[PDB]
């Protein structure tokens, strides 16, 4: 059907228009040299774990070392010359944060000096930690839900409680490439059938479609013209077929050598680069919420552990 039904049945000479390249199409007609790097890709839409164990890994140790040192200093000051023998821990770790913790009127001069030095250290550490969080927001990565064609999500949508969805155009070469890779993927795509390219675009904009599979550079063009950069691909063609486009001439066409040399002339002089500059939009570049979820949940798990420790200290 289509251009293969026109050229092979000799109602057309060649396919100067764009065409995917695979086994049996190369068996029936002869393609030209590849003139553009067009593999396949997956388009998806828009949208940290903790901040104590990876970030405060070894600074935590030295802060506890200096905390025990300053606590021993305060115990020695109180025992040299009204309750700061074992209760210096709550006072000292309240002055770590300076939470305006009501403890005592500091009569020890050495105690006031150590509290002043530690409070200046706490102010500069708070400034450094705010700068750390600022640089953490500047280093803004955008992780994806699926970073693999062999995904466990790509085996059964019961892996997570919302099942996602992705399809292609019917009777396409991409469907044949999937059926030449995984028939079970075609079985899952059978429930996810849709007709139009821009119909799938409307489904992605309105939220009636999760992901989509098409070629690489055409979706790069669609993401360049995307309204508000709402649609970003998964990578730039990493776990994909990495194919190309040619001009399918008949098997035995004398024009094949001249057209191949003409395309090799058109690529290696900046003319093809000028046409790519003219005909590819690329405004949506890379590396461009207010509620995190995982961080305060992990602090809630540590808080539940603190409930358990409080129960242990309460029963004994």
């Amino acid at each position: 059907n289509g251009m293969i039904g026109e050229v092979v049945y000799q109602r057309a000479v060649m396919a100067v228009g764009s065409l995917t390249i695979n086994e049996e199409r190369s068996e029936v007609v002869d393609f030209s040299v590849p003139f553009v790097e067009t593999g396949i890709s997956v388009m998806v839409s828009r949208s940290p774990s903790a901040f104590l164990e990876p970030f405060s890994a070894s600074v935590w140790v030295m802060m506890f070392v200096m905390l025990l040192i300053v606590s021993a200093i305060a115990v020695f000051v109180f025992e040299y010359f009204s309750f700061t023998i074992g209760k210096a821990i709550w006072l000292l770790w309240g002055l770590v944060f300076n939470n305006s913790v009501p403890v005592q009127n500091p009569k020890g001069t050495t105690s006031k000096i150590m509290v002043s030095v530690w409070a200046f250290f706490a102010v500069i550490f708070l400034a450094s930690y705010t700068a750390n969080l600022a640089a953490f927001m500047i280093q803004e990565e955008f992780v994806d839900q699926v970073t693999g064609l062999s995904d466990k999500k790509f085996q059964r949508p019961h892996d997570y409680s919302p099942p996602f969805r992705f399809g292609t155009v019917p009777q396409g070469s991409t469907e044949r490439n999937i059926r030449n890779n995984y028939p079970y993927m075609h079985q899952y795509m059978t429930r996810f059938n849709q007709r139009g390219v821009e119909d799938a675009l409307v489904s992605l904009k309105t939220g009636k479609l999760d992901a989509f599979i098409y070629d690489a550079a055409v979706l790069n063009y669609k993401a360049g013209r995307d309204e508000g950069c709402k649609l970003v691909t998964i990578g730039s063609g990493y776990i994909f077929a990495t194919t190309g486009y040619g001009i399918a001439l008949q098997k035995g066409s004398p024009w094949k050598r001249q057209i191949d040399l003409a395309l090799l002339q058109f690529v290696g002089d900046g003319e093809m680069e000028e046409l790519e500059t003219l005909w590819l939009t690329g405004i949506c570049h890379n590396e461009k919420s207010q509620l995190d979820i995982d961080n305060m949940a992990g602090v809630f798990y540590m808080l539940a552990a603190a409930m358990a420790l409080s129960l242990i200290t309460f029963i004994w």
Partner: protein, 267 residues
């Protein structure tokens, strides 16, 4: 290319209800620990909201022989929450800059326009013929020929009333109009760097002295004097952010005074 900071009212019911119910449960279980001692309820509430206050309060220390650990964990908890909240609100209001421009004629969204990017020119303008001559301006010519305007003031009123969305015009005039009307902001790129003179007759001997008088105006600072006449003479806010904040604060003050009337009537 043209509000409330999303503190509690634009944001949904996560943070305020979460912190409120959390400090409620913490205060209840610490007062129940005060019951199992190894206006005391009001003192426990004052201590809990003073730890959540984190700005200074004239309070003491209750019987916290084993409540001090949960109190210090809750105190560091509250301060790391408000520190992360300050940090990400500031970093949210720093990097809140989307793409709100065109960047010149080399825009493929304007090479294939739509019903949103409304750009046109003056009816019977020389720039229209200048683009009609060129080799790739055909689609933009077909887009601009649909809505040609009589005067430039029509274009200014249309782009002011969001009828237009872009307009090709001379740069310094648009800078003067941006000085006059600050709502009209142009793009950054510059094209068609041309010279503008006087529409004249054919070869005339008085025309030569006219051109020499123009050159005499060029050599002295009279061009800068004409710039002084027209060209040179140009022309965390907390008034929308923290104004409704103070409105809800004043309403909470009136409601709290009413609750104090209820408390004095109870006691």
């Amino acid at each position: 290319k043209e509000t409330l900071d999303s503190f509690m009212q634009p944001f949904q019911s996560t943070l305020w209800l979460l912190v409120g119910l959390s400090v409620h449960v913490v205060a209840v279980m610490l007062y129940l620990l005060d019951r199992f001692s190894p206006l005391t309820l009001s003192s426990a509430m004052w201590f809990s909201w003073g730890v959540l206050l984190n700005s200074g309060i004239g309070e003491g220390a209750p019987r916290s022989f084993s409540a001090r650990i949960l109190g210090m964990v809750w105190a560091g908890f509250a301060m790391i929450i408000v520190a992360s909240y300050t940090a990400n609100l500031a970093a949210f209001l720093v990097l809140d800059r989307p793409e709100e421009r065109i960047t010149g004629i080399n825009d493929p969204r304007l090479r294939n326009p739509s019903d949103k990017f409304i750009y046109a020119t003056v009816k019977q303008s020389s720039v229209d013929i200048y683009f009609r001559r060129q080799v790739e301006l055909s689609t933009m010519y077909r887009h601009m020929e649909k809505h040609n305007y009589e005067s430039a003031a029509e274009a200014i009123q249309a782009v002011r009333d969001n009828k237009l969305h872009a307009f090709i015009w001379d740069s310094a005039v648009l800078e003067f109009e941006a000085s006059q009307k600050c709502d009209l902001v142009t793009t950054g790129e510059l094209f068609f760097r041309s010279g503008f003179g006087i529409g004249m007759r054919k070869d005339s001997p008085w025309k030569q002295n006219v051109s020499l008088s123009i050159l005499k105006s060029h050599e002295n600072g009279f061009m800068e004097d004409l710039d002084k006449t027209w060209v040179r003479y140009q022309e965390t806010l907390t008034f929308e952010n923290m104004a409704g904040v103070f409105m809800l604060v004043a309403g909470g003050i009136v409601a709290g005074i009413f609750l104090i009337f209820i408390e004095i009537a109870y006691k």
